[PDB]
């Protein structure tokens, strides 16, 4: 299928070895320069912060409402200079925000919400508030993809309001009544470096599109290569078309 070519040919400058994997609830579809890397676990980075906000509001330890106060010390970004919820983190990816939830959680409840729903290894260490930027936790992008599109359908193992909250703080844009929701994730602290993208694409029928980039990075990558490829790939593929 010509289309299948047309994805490939967006992957012909991208001298990273990458995968951007699909899940309809039903086929997964694998594309880029690196198969293998579907089943291939990395560290979640930032993408993590799906899961740790879902544990969180379960488990009554935040709300989607609360505020997380900025003390006054200046933080490693000038963006997270301010105060937060949880929906505004998320976006902003604002680290030390989920690491004191991840602290509010604990290292018990952490590590058996995760062995409760499946999460990648479901191995957290000692460090409570590191685990997703250095390890050990790791997941592969055929468990990330199937985790939010769960997600979207309100399938994970969680309250539905719970869900319905999560989900809103993924959301990024609209077209027409087609919706993209993501999260991306620079795994900096780990050899060899990952690079995530990943969300879904809700269609106005009602139908879900879960999908995945995951690419090997290197310091002095463009930080806006891994949405701006993942738009590129979607249009590709008729998924979420431009405007």
């Given at each position: 299928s010509i289309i299948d070519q047309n994805v490939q040919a967006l992957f012909n400058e991208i001298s990273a070895d990458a995968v951007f994997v699909t899940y309809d609830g039903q086929n997964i579809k694998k594309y880029g320069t690196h198969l293998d890397r579907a089943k291939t676990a990395y560290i979640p980075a930032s993408t993590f912060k799906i899961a740790n906000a879902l544990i969180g509001l379960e488990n009554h330890?935040?709300?989607?409402?609360?505020i997380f106060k900025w003390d006054g010390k200046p933080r490693?970004?000038?963006?997270?200079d301010k105060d937060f919820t949880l929906g505004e983190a998320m976006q902003a990816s604002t680290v030390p925000v989920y690491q004191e939830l991840a602290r509010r959680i604990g290292p018990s409840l952490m590590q058996s919400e995760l062995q409760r729903i499946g999460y990648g290894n479901m191995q957290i260490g000692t460090e409570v508030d590191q685990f997703w930027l250095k390890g050990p936790l790791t997941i592969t992008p055929i468990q990330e993809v199937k985790f939010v599109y769960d997600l979207a359908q309100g399938?994970?193992?969680?309250?539905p309001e719970v869900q319905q909250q999560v989900k809103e703080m993924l959301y990024v844009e609209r077209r027409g009544e087609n919706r993209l929701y993501a999260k991306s994730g620079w795994g900096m602290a780990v050899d060899p470096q990952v690079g995530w993208y990943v969300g879904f694409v809700e269609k106005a029928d009602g139908q879900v599109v879960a999908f995945a980039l995951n690419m090997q990075m290197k310091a002095?990558?463009?930080?806006?290569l891994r949405k701006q490829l993942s738009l590129d790939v979607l249009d590709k593929l008729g998924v979420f078309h431009y405007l």
């Open positions: 330890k935040a709300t989607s409402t609360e490693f970004f000038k963006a997270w399938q994970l193992p969680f309250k002095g990558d463009d930080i806006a």
